[PDB]
Write an enzyme that holds these catalytic residues in place. Structure first.
Site, PDB file in Angstrom:
ATOM      1  N   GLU A 107     -20.389  78.878 -23.682  1.00  6.76           N
ATOM      2  CA  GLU A 107     -20.639  80.218 -23.102  1.00  6.76           C
ATOM      3  C   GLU A 107     -22.134  80.408 -23.310  1.00  6.76           C
ATOM      4  O   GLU A 107     -22.794  80.741 -22.321  1.00  6.76           O
ATOM      5  CB  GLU A 107     -19.713  81.261 -23.638  1.00  6.76           C
ATOM      6  CG  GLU A 107     -19.660  82.644 -22.976  1.00  6.76           C
ATOM      7  CD  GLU A 107     -20.966  83.373 -22.808  1.00  6.76           C
ATOM      8  OE1 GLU A 107     -21.734  83.505 -23.743  1.00  6.76           O
ATOM      9  OE2 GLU A 107     -21.129  83.800 -21.648  1.00  6.76           O
TER      10      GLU A 107
ATOM     11  N   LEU B 219     -23.428  88.396 -32.586  1.00  7.56           N
ATOM     12  CA  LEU B 219     -22.351  88.371 -31.508  1.00  7.56           C
ATOM     13  C   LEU B 219     -21.269  87.710 -32.365  1.00  7.56           C
ATOM     14  O   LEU B 219     -21.557  86.661 -32.954  1.00  7.56           O
ATOM     15  CB  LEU B 219     -23.060  87.814 -30.292  1.00  7.56           C
ATOM     16  CG  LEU B 219     -23.989  86.615 -30.445  1.00  7.56           C
ATOM     17  CD1 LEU B 219     -23.421  85.548 -31.395  1.00  7.56           C
ATOM     18  CD2 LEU B 219     -24.220  85.957 -29.085  1.00  7.56           C
TER      19      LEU B 219
HETATM   20  N1  LIG Z   1     -22.356  90.000 -26.618  1.00  5.80           N
HETATM   21  C1  LIG Z   1     -23.462  90.082 -25.874  1.00  5.80           C
HETATM   22  O1  LIG Z   1     -23.676  89.636 -24.761  1.00  5.80           O
HETATM   23  C2  LIG Z   1     -24.587  90.774 -26.635  1.00  5.80           C
HETATM   24  C3  LIG Z   1     -24.317  91.198 -27.884  1.00  5.80           C
HETATM   25  N2  LIG Z   1     -25.389  91.847 -28.551  1.00  5.80           N
HETATM   26  C4  LIG Z   1     -25.282  92.399 -29.975  1.00  5.80           C
HETATM   27  O2  LIG Z   1     -25.628  93.830 -29.964  1.00  5.80           O
HETATM   28  C5  LIG Z   1     -26.261  94.098 -31.293  1.00  5.80           C
HETATM   29  C6  LIG Z   1     -27.662  94.700 -30.979  1.00  5.80           C
HETATM   30  O3  LIG Z   1     -27.371  95.989 -30.464  1.00  5.80           O
HETATM   31  P1  LIG Z   1     -28.085  97.393 -30.578  1.00  5.80           P
HETATM   32  O4  LIG Z   1     -27.942  97.709 -32.004  1.00  5.80           O
HETATM   33  O5  LIG Z   1     -27.587  98.448 -29.790  1.00  5.80           O
HETATM   34  O6  LIG Z   1     -29.667  97.218 -30.312  1.00  5.80           O
HETATM   35  P2  LIG Z   1     -30.664  96.806 -29.170  1.00  5.80           P
HETATM   36  O7  LIG Z   1     -30.655  95.310 -29.155  1.00  5.80           O
HETATM   37  O8  LIG Z   1     -30.485  97.519 -27.924  1.00  5.80           O
HETATM   38  O9  LIG Z   1     -32.067  97.175 -29.964  1.00  5.80           O
HETATM   39  C7  LIG Z   1     -32.213  98.510 -30.551  1.00  5.80           C
HETATM   40  C8  LIG Z   1     -33.729  98.745 -30.479  1.00  5.80           C
HETATM   41  O10 LIG Z   1     -34.202  98.490 -29.372  1.00  5.80           O
HETATM   42  C9  LIG Z   1     -35.165  99.461 -28.896  1.00  5.80           C
HETATM   43  N3  LIG Z   1     -34.676 100.112 -27.704  1.00  5.80           N
HETATM   44  C10 LIG Z   1     -33.485  99.826 -27.101  1.00  5.80           C
HETATM   45  N4  LIG Z   1     -33.273 100.530 -26.018  1.00  5.80           N
HETATM   46  C11 LIG Z   1     -34.468 101.330 -26.009  1.00  5.80           C
HETATM   47  C12 LIG Z   1     -34.986 102.429 -25.025  1.00  5.80           C
HETATM   48  N5  LIG Z   1     -34.214 102.795 -23.980  1.00  5.80           N
HETATM   49  N6  LIG Z   1     -36.130 102.912 -25.300  1.00  5.80           N
HETATM   50  C13 LIG Z   1     -36.809 102.449 -26.382  1.00  5.80           C
HETATM   51  N7  LIG Z   1     -36.506 101.566 -27.281  1.00  5.80           N
HETATM   52  C14 LIG Z   1     -35.265 101.058 -27.009  1.00  5.80           C
HETATM   53  C15 LIG Z   1     -35.306 100.449 -30.073  1.00  5.80           C
HETATM   54  O11 LIG Z   1     -36.130  99.920 -31.055  1.00  5.80           O
HETATM   55  P3  LIG Z   1     -37.027 100.539 -32.383  1.00  5.80           P
HETATM   56  O12 LIG Z   1     -36.011 101.040 -33.347  1.00  5.80           O
HETATM   57  O13 LIG Z   1     -38.033  99.477 -32.604  1.00  5.80           O
HETATM   58  O14 LIG Z   1     -37.676 101.775 -31.748  1.00  5.80           O
HETATM   59  C16 LIG Z   1     -33.832 100.377 -30.558  1.00  5.80           C
HETATM   60  O15 LIG Z   1     -33.704 100.314 -32.038  1.00  5.80           O
HETATM   61  C17 LIG Z   1     -26.150  92.783 -32.120  1.00  5.80           C
HETATM   62  O16 LIG Z   1     -24.800  92.643 -32.661  1.00  5.80           O
HETATM   63  C18 LIG Z   1     -26.265  91.751 -30.957  1.00  5.80           C
HETATM   64  O17 LIG Z   1     -25.771  90.528 -31.321  1.00  5.80           O
HETATM   65  C19 LIG Z   1     -26.672  92.028 -27.992  1.00  5.80           C
HETATM   66  C20 LIG Z   1     -26.940  91.623 -26.769  1.00  5.80           C
HETATM   67  C21 LIG Z   1     -25.941  90.919 -25.907  1.00  5.80           C
HETATM   68  C1  LIG Z   2     -23.031  84.859 -26.419  1.00  6.69           C
HETATM   69  C2  LIG Z   2     -24.472  84.669 -25.818  1.00  6.69           C
HETATM   70  C3  LIG Z   2     -24.632  85.595 -24.618  1.00  6.69           C
HETATM   71  N1  LIG Z   2     -23.934  85.214 -23.530  1.00  6.69           N
HETATM   72  C4  LIG Z   2     -24.070  85.972 -22.399  1.00  6.69           C
HETATM   73  N2  LIG Z   2     -23.344  85.556 -21.309  1.00  6.69           N
HETATM   74  N3  LIG Z   2     -24.827  87.093 -22.436  1.00  6.69           N
HETATM   75  C5  LIG Z   2     -25.516  87.541 -23.488  1.00  6.69           C
HETATM   76  N4  LIG Z   2     -26.315  88.654 -23.471  1.00  6.69           N
HETATM   77  C6  LIG Z   2     -25.479  86.754 -24.637  1.00  6.69           C
HETATM   78  C7  LIG Z   2     -26.114  87.087 -25.827  1.00  6.69           C
HETATM   79  C8  LIG Z   2     -25.806  88.243 -26.494  1.00  6.69           C
HETATM   80  C9  LIG Z   2     -26.401  88.589 -27.719  1.00  6.69           C
HETATM   81  C10 LIG Z   2     -27.329  87.769 -28.354  1.00  6.69           C
HETATM   82 CL1  LIG Z   2     -28.063  88.202 -29.863  1.00  6.69          CL
HETATM   83  C11 LIG Z   2     -27.633  86.602 -27.655  1.00  6.69           C
HETATM   84  N5  LIG Z   2     -28.537  85.765 -28.140  1.00  6.69           N
HETATM   85  N6  LIG Z   2     -28.881  84.598 -27.545  1.00  6.69           N
HETATM   86  N7  LIG Z   2     -29.061  83.506 -28.459  1.00  6.69           N
HETATM   87  C12 LIG Z   2     -29.900  82.405 -28.167  1.00  6.69           C
HETATM   88  C13 LIG Z   2     -29.358  81.464 -27.103  1.00  6.69           C
HETATM   89  O1  LIG Z   2     -30.397  80.413 -26.970  1.00  6.69           O
HETATM   90  C14 LIG Z   2     -30.734  80.306 -25.669  1.00  6.69           C
HETATM   91  C15 LIG Z   2     -31.627  79.173 -25.210  1.00  6.69           C
HETATM   92  O2  LIG Z   2     -30.373  80.987 -24.682  1.00  6.69           O
HETATM   93  C16 LIG Z   2     -28.531  83.672 -29.831  1.00  6.69           C
HETATM   94  C17 LIG Z   2     -27.839  82.317 -29.998  1.00  6.69           C
HETATM   95  C18 LIG Z   2     -28.657  81.322 -30.585  1.00  6.69           C
HETATM   96  C19 LIG Z   2     -28.225  80.027 -30.841  1.00  6.69           C
HETATM   97  C20 LIG Z   2     -26.937  79.696 -30.480  1.00  6.69           C
HETATM   98  C21 LIG Z   2     -26.107  80.650 -29.894  1.00  6.69           C
HETATM   99  C22 LIG Z   2     -26.517  81.959 -29.655  1.00  6.69           C
HETATM  100  C23 LIG Z   2     -27.034  86.236 -26.429  1.00  6.69           C
END
Ligand SMILES: NC(=O)C1=CN([C@@H]2O[C@H](COP(=O)(O)OP(=O)(O)OC[C@H]3O[C@@H](n4cnc5c(N)ncnc54)[C@H](OP(=O)(O)O)[C@@H]3O)[C@@H](O)[C@H]2O)C=CC1
Ligand SMILES: CCc1nc(N)nc(N)c1-c1ccc(Cl)c(/N=N/N(CCOC(C)=O)Cc2ccccc2)c1
Length: 205
Positions: A31, A24
């Protein structure tokens, strides 16, 4: 399968950006503190028995700091099509979201002291896409980051947009508070030169 509604939790920029380089792209302690309250909060009468669930795609799994997982006080489930091995101690993996839910129901039925409260999908983009299409997803906890930071990963449905305005509606702040149970800051919040705000979007099933 299913019985209960799904809740999606995301933090995104105004351009719907959610990550860059399997991370992220920002550092927000208040947050991230919010993510934690939402995802582990169960009512008092129910916190007695009930525990929440965090559903995530494995790259989001990887992407988490070794230090903070399995996320604590929560049932962690990793959606992976190639469920070969899952390094964990009571950490479940499932083929898909419906698989994750039959798994949980099956596993946390009548032969359990631990009951499920709320179910949250925590991403990433591929898991957010599948939830958005699930008939049980009715609420989006979104954190809007008022800055166009470079991302390479984007949220899959432009829900705050004009095109989705008859289905997804933004809820009053007082009801976001009432749902999470902790009072929450209204308006813009400034932390490390970033502007953000909390919202709750809901749709009718
Ligand atoms: N800002 C936020 O709140 C968030 C930000 N992020 C960011 O997003 C990124 C991760 O994103 P993304 O690459 O899309 O990957 P995902 O985290 O969605 O994981 C991808 C893997 O998950 C499995 N998967 C996901 N959806 C399915 C489905 N419908 N059926 C089966 N398997 C599924 C597959 O695994 P396999 O290949 O093992 O089959 C696919 O490779 C990182 O940068 C993370 O930090 C992530 C969450 C929240
Ligand atoms: C921006 C964090 C966030 N906020 C909201 N509102 N929604 C989301 N889906 C996420 C969110 C999105 C992507 C990742 Cl990888 C995430 N990991 N969640 N972490 C762990 C947080 O630890 C706990 C106890 O919850 C990574 C991380 C680790 C350590 C510090 C900061 C971030 C959390």
């Amino acid at each position: 399968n299913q019985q209960k509604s799904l809740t999606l939790i995301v933090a995104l920029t105004t351009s719907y950006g959610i990550g860059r380089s399997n991370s992220l792209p920002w550092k927000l302690k208040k947050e991230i503190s919010y993510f934690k309250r939402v995802t582990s909060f169960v009512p008092t009468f129910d916190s007695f028995e009930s525990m929440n669930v965090v559903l995530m795609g494995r790259k989001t799994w990887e992407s988490i700091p070794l230090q903070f997982r399995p996320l604590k006080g929560r049932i962690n489930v990793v959606i992976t099509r190639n469920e070969s091995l899952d390094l964990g101690n009571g950490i479940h993996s499932a083929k898909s979201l419906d698989h994750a839910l039959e798994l949980l129901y099956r596993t946390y039925g009548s032969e359990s002291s631990v009951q499920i409260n709320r179910i949250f999908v925590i991403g990433g983009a591929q898991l957010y896409k599948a939830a958005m299409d699930h008939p049980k997803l009715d609420r989006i906890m979104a954190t809007i980051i008022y800055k166009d930071i470079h991302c390479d990963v984007f949220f899959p449905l432009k829900f705050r947009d004009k095109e989705w305005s008859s289905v997804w509606k933004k809820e009053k702040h007082s009801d976001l508070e009432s749902w999470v149970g902790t009072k929450v800051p209204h308006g813009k919040i400034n932390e490390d030169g970033f502007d953000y705000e909390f919202e709750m979007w809901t749709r009718d099933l």
